[PDB]
Design a protein around this ligand. Structure first.
Ligand SMILES: CC(=O)N[C@H]1[C@@H](OP(=O)(O)OP(=O)(O)OC[C@H]2O[C@@H](n3ccc(=O)[nH]c3=O)[C@H](O)[C@@H]2O)O[C@H](CO)[C@@H](O)[C@@H]1O
Length: 321
C-alpha cells in the first residue's frame, strides 16, 4: 500500500510565502506515489491514517514533531530545516535540538546546510534543492539599471541593507530599486520614509505571486540581503527567469548560487552592495558584471528543475518507508 504523507507547515492556508509554497509544491510533487495532505499541526482527527511526516521548521513545528515521534518511535519522520531553525535556533533552543534528535531524516534545502548541523546529525541529513517554473529570459535595456528585492519585511531579510544601499545611491537617476513585500517590526515606516527621500527607491508592498515573478523577470538584477536563508524561493525564481542576482554572502545564499559566484557582498555591508550595483550599471555601457553573473546563473538554473526535486523527494519518501 502507498504511504499516507502528512506535511506540517506553520504557514496559514493560502498564504503567499515560502513555507506555504514549499508545502503545496511538495504535495503536488509526491502525489504520483502517495496520498498527501498539508496541516498546520498534528495530530488531528485524521491522524491515524498517516504513515509518514514531513514537518517544516524544527522549532515552530516542534510540538507536532514530538507528538509524531512519541506516536511512532524510530519511523516515518523527516524534519525540514527551513532556515531560521538551522541558522539560529538549533544553537540553543531546546525544542529545535529535540526535533533534530527525533527525526529519521533531516532535510536541508541547499548543499551547505548540513555543515550547520551537529556532526552526529549529518549522517541522516539529506539535500532537497527546491524547484520552480521557468520564465523566458527577456532582453533588457542598457539605458538604466532596475533592481528588485522580494521578501515580506522581517528583520531576517535585513531590508536595512537595501535601504542603506538605496541611500548611497540617492543621487543616481540611472539606477532604480523596487522592493516587494508586506510590511510584516516597523520596517514599513522605514520604507515609506526612504521612498520619499529617494525617488529611485519604491516599496511596492505585497504583490501576488504572478505579478512578483513578472517583476523579477523584468528586472536587471535580483537583490537579496537576508541574514540567513534555508534556500530562498526568490533566488531560484530569478535564476530560472534569466535574472542574475546580488546576494549577501551567507550559507543559505551561497548554497543556492554557487561557491565561486561573483555576486556576493558581506552581509549587512550596504556599501559593498551599492558598489556591486554601480559595477552592474557601468557594465551596460561597454562583457560587464551583469553578463558574467548571468552566465553563472544559467549554470545554476538546472538545480531548480521540478523533475530533480521530485526525484530527491521520491528517494527521501522510500527512506522514511
Ligand atoms: C529562512 C528564510 O529566511 N526563508 C525561508 C522561508 O521562505 P520565505 O518566505 O522567508 O522567503 P522565500 O523567498 O523562500 O519565499 C517567498 C515567496 O513569496 C513570494 N512573494 C513574497 C512577497 C510578495 O510580496 N509577493 C510574493 O509573491 C516570493 O516570490 C516567494 O515565492 O521558508 C522557505 C521554505 O519553506 C525557505 O526556502 C526560505 O529560505
Amino acid at each position: 500500500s502507498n504511504p499516507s504523507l502528512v506535511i506540517v507547515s506553520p504557514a496559514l492556508p493560502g498564504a503567499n510565502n515560502g513555507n506555504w509554497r514549499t508545502a503545496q509544491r511538495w504535495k503536488a510533487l509526491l502525489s504520483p506515489v502517495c496520498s498527501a495532505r498539508v496541516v498546520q499541526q498534528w495530530p488531528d482527527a485524521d491522524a491515524s491514517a498517516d504513515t509518514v511526516m514531513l514537518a517544516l521548521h524544527a522549532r515552530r513545528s516542534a510540538e507536532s514533531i514530538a507528538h509524531w515521534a512519541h506516536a511512532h518511535p524510530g519511523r516515518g519522520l523527516g524534519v525540514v530545516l527551513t532556515g531560521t531553525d538551522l541558522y539560529q535556533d538549533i544553537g540553543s533552543d531546546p525544542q529545535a535540538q529535540r526535533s533534530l534528535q527525533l527525526a529519521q531524516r533531516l532535510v536541508v534545502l541547499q548543499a551547505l546546510g548540513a555543515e550547520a548541523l551537529p556532526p552526529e546529525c549529518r549522517a541522516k541529513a539529506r539535500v532537497v534543492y527546491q524547484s520552480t517554473s521557468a520564465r523566458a529570459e527577456l532582453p533588457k535595456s542598457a539605458r538604466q539599471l532596475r533592481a528588485v528585492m522580494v521578501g515580506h519585511l522581517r528583520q531576517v531579510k535585513s531590508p536595512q541593507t537595501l535601504f542603506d544601499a538605496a541611500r548611497l545611491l540617492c543621487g543616481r537617476e540611472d539606477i532604480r530599486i523596487d522592493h516587494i513585500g508586506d510590511a510584516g517590526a516597523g520596517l514599513g515606516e522605514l520604507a515609506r520614509a526612504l521612498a520619499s527621500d529617494c525617488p529611485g527607491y519604491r516599496w511596492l508592498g505585497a504583490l501576488p505571486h504572478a505579478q512578483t515573478r513578472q517583476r523579477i523577470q523584468r528586472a536587471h538584477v535580483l537583490v537579496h540581503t537576508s541574514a540567513l536563508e534555508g534556500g530562498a524561493h526568490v533566488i531560484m525564481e530569478a535564476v530560472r527567469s534569466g535574472t542574475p542576482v546580488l546576494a549577501s554572502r551567507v550559507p543559505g545564499n551561497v548554497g543556492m548560487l554557487g561557491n565561486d559566484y561573483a555576486g556576493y557582498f558581506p552581509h549587512g555591508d550596504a556599501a559593498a552592495l551599492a558598489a556591486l550595483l554601480e559595477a552592474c550599471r557601468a557594465g551596460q555601457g561597454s562583457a560587464g558584471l551583469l553578463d558574467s553573473l548571468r552566465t553563472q546563473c544559467a549554470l545554476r538554473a538546472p538545480l531548480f528543475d521540478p523533475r530533480a526535486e521530485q526525484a530527491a523527494l521520491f528517494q527521501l519518501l522510500n527512506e522514511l518507508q
